[PDB]
Curated annotation (Swiss-Prot):
It is found in: Secreted. It comes from Panus similis (Lentinoid fungus). Cu(2+) binds at H1, H78, Y164. This is AA9 family lytic polysaccharide monooxygenase A. Its main location: secreted.
Amino acid sequence: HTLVWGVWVNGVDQGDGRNIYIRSPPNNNPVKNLTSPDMTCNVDNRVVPKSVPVNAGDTLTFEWYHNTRDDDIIASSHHGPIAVYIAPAASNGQGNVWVKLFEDAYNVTNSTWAVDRLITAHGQHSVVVPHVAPGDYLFRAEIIALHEADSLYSQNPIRGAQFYISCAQITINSSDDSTPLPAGVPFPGAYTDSTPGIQFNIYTTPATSYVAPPPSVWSGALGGSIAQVGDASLE
Ligand SMILES: *[C@@H]1O[C@H](CO)[C@@H](O)[C@H](O)[C@H]1NC(C)=O
Ligand SMILES: [Cu+2]
């Protein structure tokens, strides 16, 4: 159970984004139905009033929280991967529009899932804004918690992979458009019952055999990190 509080640009807190530039759901409950429209931007997908201005090559940091800002972030049990996608805002998340910028599942060195490192990072993970056309975009941050993913939700609705989905409204002002955005995948639709990484037993299978759901990271992505970029407690 986790939600996004807001974003930082180049290490500067943009302020409380909930229902302002984040299409916030009413609570931190997971989405589980792979075929639901809730898979796009969670249960309350509507235009919110602000869009955060960035430039190509900026560091965009998402900040997650559980109940209050800079708390335990997410229950330790919720081991799983983190991905970020982008789509043109015009689409409203509909159609074959989502392009993946970031994937982090399991770091073999540190023996930590992306979620374990997100807790240590005080809920902060970043992407570098790609060189796409100037304009209005949705950034979709997605956490998959795998602690009950041995079962499919489609067969046992008590269990299943849990999706924590947040869409931020981002405006890209300055860009050389050297990597125009290609066509992407649909949400709902990209993940099905047979997609790798949706059904997985974290208790019995070693984390090193985990494969994150496709699609793969676009070659125009400039990377990202799970790491604290600012101290929320200095505000
Ligand atoms: C999944 O959501 C779809 C689309 O709204 C709906 O048809 C179906 O009833 C849901 N499945 C379950 C298992 O609730
Ligand atoms: Cu939870």
